[PDB]
Design a protein around this ligand. Structure first.
Ligand code: HEM
Ligand code: HEM
Ligand code: HEM
Lengths: 29, 54, 418, 47, 51, 446, 99, 55, 55
């Protein structure tokens, strides 16, 4: 789960990508 | 300052009666007043802008 | 049709696949990012990513925004530590206009002082939005602690440099790092000759390799944030193989063996070995996964854990012990096969979508030049043996480790203790 | 949390047209708005 | 002036023209009624009962 | 040199077939080696009464937690071992379970889907565990402001109607739910005529149909004791619900008007109108130069962190409006500008912005239907709602028919002089009183 | 020829007498304000000091010494490129609005 | 853009005075007698002006 | 404490209007004719009121 910290955008969408970073079942637990 | 002098002239004409010498002076003064405010001043301003390389 | 790869004399790589789809996606992948920033110009990559809509020589900011919006297109900038990707997506009929806009943005930026000064606040806004999820800051600190050089640079501008990024620095970065040998123009739904024509039209200038960043050097440090959050995010990693190497595939298989991401929603991650290994010890809300980052120079592999502040030590220790058990040889052939299947399926699912396929083609073109078919990638995955996975685990256990922790951190272990 | 509160019933106040909960409001919206605006129009005429 | 001499402005003008005409009708009726202008009212049926 | 029209013509066509029990098997075939196969069920909170509200969410929670054929760990182990991703989503109108998996693994995926849908254990211990989890998740969902404000919008807009109920349901129902209620919910709402088996990607329609006949055939559409649930139209009530919590950093306001159903033709012009209004977030790069007047003004004055326009459609009613997050002292201005844009579209829309909206809608339609998961989702939802998967060519024709006159007509019908439904959260004191909001819905000039 | 009369107007206008330059005397409409805010800081500070000194001179009804008057050739149109760019951008926005 | 009611100075004063003035929700009919006094003053001014044309 | 001239509402208005109004330093005698008009208006109002006591 890279969880690329995407930013909502139109006509300019800055997206930055990191590497697998978990945060998989935190909501579940 | 031509406009200011024209207003002075219009005042003088209004004081004086409506006879041959003053009628034509009044008509000319009125035409000149409106011309200066409407046509002459904007055109002269445009000429000035052209002179200052605008 | 099939993907067509052409290496132009200037060094640019042009790729096109005519999918005959309603939408066409064109992406310019440039080998620039946080890695190629020096200490003086830190964060310039961030503002460059934000400054995709500023006035260019070809078109003004107004024209770019209005035209891209009018055709219904999207202009997106995706930045990694080693890569920056400019992509335009729209209907195939109007792809030429967005292609002109894209090359105007990439090749002839003006970086007018007033526009950069106005955009400098977007640096802080973007940094705050990205740092809302703790994972971003934890990974930034993890990269900073692991490497003492290029790879340590953050994907987001440092706070002291928020208002200090200068237009001259942006111009220098573009001139020295946005170069034809470093670029690959990838197109989906666009014929190869048209892409070639546009590449000659705009990307002819600024040829050459450009400035070269220094090799990343492992630092083996720790950064502990102490932000007071309830849950503690801790990542413990060790140096690994560079991308496109045999040991890199071994490390990917190891990541899938330990457990990378749940496949069943609200599941128990039964296949994931780390998850169960931690779960038996800790009955509190917890999370654990394997962190596999591969870059051209080097890579990092390790464990990422999210757990209650009090129980962070137990979770980290249990995950580390499970990796140690894998390293000692307690690895079944069935687990290796299941991980191989999961990895192959993940690769296929990633390249399934248009965005994923474009990103994969660009990454392969930049890193390795040529494009490798999915079948060959799957064959590489299959070639990995169980012994390779065991050796990767042994390398992670034996190697010097770097750790980043954020949260209460009262009970979070230090690297020496682990 | 936010799912334990239901909008209190206003039926006693509601107009007869919208008392039903299985009837589309848009059907009688024109009628109700016409009535209110008619009252307004008559007031304005008198004024 | 040249700014507003554009097709979109023509479209907006067409959109608002019926409204402008209706407001003109309102103004005409208002004037005629307020002044009780007999010239117009003379033709108006059952308003001609006055005067 | 394929053109947009030619590309639409070359799109693979969905083939729909029906099993005798009533299950509809639909497939779109592509050369991709990965397939997404899912079962879409026409069950949701709108079909739930007060006492059993949230039973759908409970069943969704415990559906992957075990079957009679394979226990709880077994299902997850099979799914992960073949590399598949199993996911479910529950909405007020639809419930779905879909499996992302390799094309060669289609038979096993279909088996697992059938087992989940039909032979669900609903074991009591797992029921208690999921009860605890769901209570915790409700407490978590309280934090998500957007979800809360939308739930408030549904509660106030559709008050006294089943649509007002949340998908998760009140906590009291969650703790009071029992195995009998969950079993009854499954028996009543999970029926073959109300289910659709959809697939996308490397799936052969004949093979999918044969697998369906093998596994889903037992499921029946007969209702026990002829207790047949009957669909109920839901009344739209113009109302305002304000949860004033000044401690919250930013104020969330959602304002909407009653909208068309799924099958109503007016959805397309309304989507064009909403695209004209647009969407803005502080992170957008376009800023002031963005075409949307509301977005441009918001960026120039920093009125709102984010604003987006939504067109939620249900079977017979829908919520049409926008949701904007803004500072405490900018709510009134943003509401004024939003209503001004609504009235401008209603009264004096122009051709150019209509073309922009149509192009944006075309791009959204084509971009969304990319990948096996969204394509399968669209297939299932279209079969459940439209009764047919509207082909992209039909969507393009309907979009092309839209003109400025059409946009003005539909916007005047749905937006002008219509009582709106408003939900506010946070420091919403500056939010105008409902009389002012309703007054803004019409122009004294027009 | 024309340069003769232009030089005459330059001397006739008194902004050289106050030490000002031509672009200092332009009327500050919205385009001019944007052009000013786009000026580099050195040009901006020079502008504000020139205008302040001119206002001070006019306050006491005095004129700058003859040697310190601005020269018609030495006058530099610092604001002209920025103002032209602002006007061009406004023209483009208007043109897009037209149709 | 800005709303003319909130931005134009005369309109700003008029708005803050009798359009967006925050008023208590429970003021009774005894709180209308002030506006009644203002109306009476305007009426007296108009009527007295018309009376003085003949006084 | 606060300065009464700044704080008190009527005094605040008078202060901003006439006392601490930012004014250009170079305005000449021609600008005094506005205040002269104000003085003329006040003088006319008082003078005409006192005339009207006997008219
Ligand atoms: C608060 C405002 C005013 C009050 C309370 C007031 C009061 C009165 C009263 C009690 C009378 C006696 C009327 C009568 O005996 O029939 C009167 C008469 C008169 N007032 Fe006023 N007045 C007011 C304003 C004005 C103004 C503003 C004007 C002129 C501009 C005016 C002009 C007159 C005149 C002409 C009369 C004579 C009417 C008559 O002989 O019946 N008043 N006023
Ligand atoms: C009873 C009539 C008037 C009064 C009491 C009045 C009062 C004032 C005052 C006190 C000022 C402050 C600046 C100064 O005093 O020079 C001013 C400025 C001004 N007034 Fe009036 N004035 C009157 C008539 C007019 C008329 C007839 C005009 C135009 C036809 C006018 C237009 C202006 C202008 C343009 C200014 C700007 C002065 C500046 O730029 O500094 N005023 N007025
Ligand atoms: C403020 C501007 C005013 C102007 C320009 C003005 C102008 C004049 C003029 C030109 C006359 C005629 C003088 C004459 O030929 O004898 C006059 C007379 C008069 N004005 Fe005013 N006036 C003003 C204000 C007022 C006010 C406020 C009053 C209030 C009662 C007033 C009351 C009178 C009266 C009663 C007369 C007649 C007595 C007389 O003519 O001597 N005036 N005014």
């Amino acid at each position: 789960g890279p969880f690329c910290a995407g930013v909502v955008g139109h006509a300019a969408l800055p997206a930055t990508s990191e590497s697998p970073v978990l945060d998989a079942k935190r909501s579940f637990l | 300052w031509m406009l200011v002098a024209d207003l002075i002239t219009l005042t003088w004409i209004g004081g004086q009666p409506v006879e041959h010498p003053f009628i034509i002076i009044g008509q000319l003064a009125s035409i000149l007043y409106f011309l200066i405010i409407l046509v002459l001043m904007p055109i002269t301003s445009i000429i000035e802008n052209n002179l200052l390389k605008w | 049709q099939d993907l067509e790869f052409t290496r132009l004399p200037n060094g640019l790589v042009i790729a096109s696949l005519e999918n005959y789809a309603p939408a066409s996606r064109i992406g310019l992948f440039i080998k620039a990012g946080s890695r190629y920033e020096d200490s003086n110009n830190l964060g310039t990559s961030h503002l460059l990513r934000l400054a995709s809509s500023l006035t260019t020589k070809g078109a003004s900011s107004f024209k770019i925004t209005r035209g891209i919006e009018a055709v219904g297109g999207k202009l997106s900038v995706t930045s990694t530590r080693e890569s920056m990707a400019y992509t335009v997506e729209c209907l195939r009929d109007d792809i030429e206009i967005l292609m002109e806009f894209l090359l105007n943005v990439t090749a002839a930026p003006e970086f007018r002082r007033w526009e950069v000064a106005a955009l400098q606040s977007q640096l802080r806004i973007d940094k705050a939005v990205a740092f809302q999820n703790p994972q971003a800051q934890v990974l930034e600190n993890l990269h900073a602690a692991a490497y003492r050089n290029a790879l340590a640079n953050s994907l987001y501008c440092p706070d002291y440099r928020i208002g200090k990024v200068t237009p001259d620095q942006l111009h220098y970065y573009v001139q020295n790092h946005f170069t034809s040998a470093r670029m690959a123009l990838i197109g989906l739904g666009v014929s190869h000759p048209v892409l070639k024509q546009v590449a000659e039209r705009f990307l002819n200038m600024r040829g050459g390799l450009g400035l070269s960043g220094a090799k990343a050097k492992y630092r083996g440090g720790e950064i502990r944030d102490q932000n007071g959050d309830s849950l503690v995010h801790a990542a413990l990693v060790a140096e690994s193989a560079a991308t496109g190497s045999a040991e890199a595939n071994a490390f990917s298989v190891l990541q899938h063996v330990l457990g990378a991401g749940p496949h069943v929603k609200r599941g128990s991650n039964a296949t994931s070995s780390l998850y169960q290994a931690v779960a038996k010890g800790v009955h509190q809300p917890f999370d654990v996964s394997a962190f596999n980052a591969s870059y051209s120079d080097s890579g990092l592999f390790g464990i990422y854990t999210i757990s209650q502040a009090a129980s962070a030590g137990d979770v980290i220790k249990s995950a580390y012990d499970q990796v140690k058990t894998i390293a000692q040889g307690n690895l079944s052939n069935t687990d290796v096969q299941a991980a191989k299947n999961k990895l192959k399926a993940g690769y296929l699912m990633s390249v399934e979508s248009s965005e994923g396929f474009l990103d994969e083609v660009g990454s392969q073109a930049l890193v390795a030049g040529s494009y490798v078919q999915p079948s060959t990638v799957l064959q590489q995955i299959d070639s990995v043996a169980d012994a390779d996975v065991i050796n990767a685990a042994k390398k992670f256990v034996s190697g010097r480790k770097s750790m980043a922790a954020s949260g209460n951190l009262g009970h979070t272990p230090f690297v020496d203790e682990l | 949390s936010h799912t334990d509160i239901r909008v209190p019933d206003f039926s006693d106040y509601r107009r007869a047209e919208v008392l039903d909960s299985t009837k589309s409001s848009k059907e009688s919206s024109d009628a109700r708005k016409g009535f209110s605006y008619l009252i307004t129009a008559t007031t304005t005429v008198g004024v | 002036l040249s700014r507003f001499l554009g097709p979109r402005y023509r479209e907006l003008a067409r959109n608002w023209i019926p409204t402008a005409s209706m407001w003109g009708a309102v103004g005409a009726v208002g004037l005629v009624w307020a002044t009780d202008w007999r010239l117009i009212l003379d033709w108006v049926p059952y308003i001609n009962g006055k005067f | 040199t394929a053109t947009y029209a030619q590309a639409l013509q070359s799109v693979p066509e969905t083939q729909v077939s029906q099993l005798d029990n009533g299950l509809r098997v639909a497939s779109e075939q592509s050369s991709q080696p990965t397939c997404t196969v899912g079962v879409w069920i026409d069950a949701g909170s709108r079909y739930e009464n007060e006492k059993n509200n949230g039973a759908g969410y409970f069943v969704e929670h415990l559906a992957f937690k075990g079957t009679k054929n394979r226990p709880g760990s077994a299902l997850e182990k099979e799914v992960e071992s073949m590399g598949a991703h199993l996911n479910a989503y529950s909405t007020r109108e639809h419930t779905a379970y879909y499996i992302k998996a390799l094309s060669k693994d289609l038979p096993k995926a279909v088996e697992l889907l059938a087992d989940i849908v039909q032979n669900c254990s609903l074991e009591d211990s797992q029921i208690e565990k999921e009860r605890d989890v769901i209570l915790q998740e409700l407490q978590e969902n309280d934090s998500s402001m957007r979800d809360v404000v939308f739930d408030y919008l549904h509660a106030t807009a559709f008050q006294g109607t089943p649509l007002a109920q949340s998908v998760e349901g009140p906590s009291e129902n969650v703790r009071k739910l029992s195995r009998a209620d969950l079993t009854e919910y499954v028996s009543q709402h999970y029926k073959a005529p109300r289910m659709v088996l959809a697939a996308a990607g490397g799936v052969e329609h004949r093979q999918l149909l044969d697998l369906a006949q093998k596994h889903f055939s037992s499921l029946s559409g007969t209702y026990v004791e002829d207790a047949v649930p009957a669909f109920t139209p839901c009344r739209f009530t113009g109302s305002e619900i304000r949860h004033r919590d000044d401690a919250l950093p930013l104020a969330h306001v959602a304002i909407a008007v009653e909208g068309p159903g799924w099958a109503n033709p007016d959805n397309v012009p309304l989507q064009v109108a909403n695209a004209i209004i647009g969407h803005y977030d502080s992170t957008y790069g376009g800023g002031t130069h963005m075409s949307s007047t509301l977005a441009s003004v918001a960026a120039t004055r920093k009125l709102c962190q984010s604003f987006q326009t939504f067109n939620i459609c249900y079977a017979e009613t829908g919520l049409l409006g926008a949701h904007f997050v803004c500072d405490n002292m900018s709510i009134d201005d943003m509401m004024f500008f939003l209503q001004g844009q609504w009235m401008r579209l209603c009264t004096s829309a122009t051709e150019s912005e209509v073309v922009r909206g149509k192009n944006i809608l075309r791009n959204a339609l084509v971009s969304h239907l990319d990948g096996t998961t969204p394509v399968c989702e669209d297939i299932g939802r279209s079969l459940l709602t439209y009764g047919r998967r509207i082909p992209l060519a039909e969507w393009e024709s309907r979009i092309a028919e839209v003109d400025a006159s059409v946009v003005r007509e539909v916007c005047s019908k749905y937006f002008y002089d219509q009582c709106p439904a408003v939900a506010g959260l946070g420091p919403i004191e500056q939010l105008p009183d409902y009389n002012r909001i309703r007054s803004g819905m019409f122009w004294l000039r027009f | 020829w024309l340069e003769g009369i232009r030089k005459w107007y330059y001397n006739a206008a008194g902004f050289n007498k106050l030490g000002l330059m031509r672009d200092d005397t332009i009327y500050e409409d919205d385009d001019v304000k944007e052009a000013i805010r786009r000026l580099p800081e050195n040009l901006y500070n020079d502008r504000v000091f020139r205008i302040k000194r001119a206002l001070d001179l006019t306050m006491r009804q005095q004129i700058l010494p003859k040697e310190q008057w601005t020269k018609y050739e030495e006058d530099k149109f610092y604001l002209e490129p920025y103002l032209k760019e602002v006007i061009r951008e406004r023209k483009e926005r208007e043109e897009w609005a037209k149709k | 853009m800005t709303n003319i009611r909130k931005s134009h100075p005369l309109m700003k004063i008029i708005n803050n005075a009798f359009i967006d003035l925050p008023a208590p929700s429970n003021i009774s009919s005894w709180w209308n007698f002030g506006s009644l006094l203002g109306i009476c003053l305007i009426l007296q001014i108009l009527t007295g002006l018309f009376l003085a044309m003949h006084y």
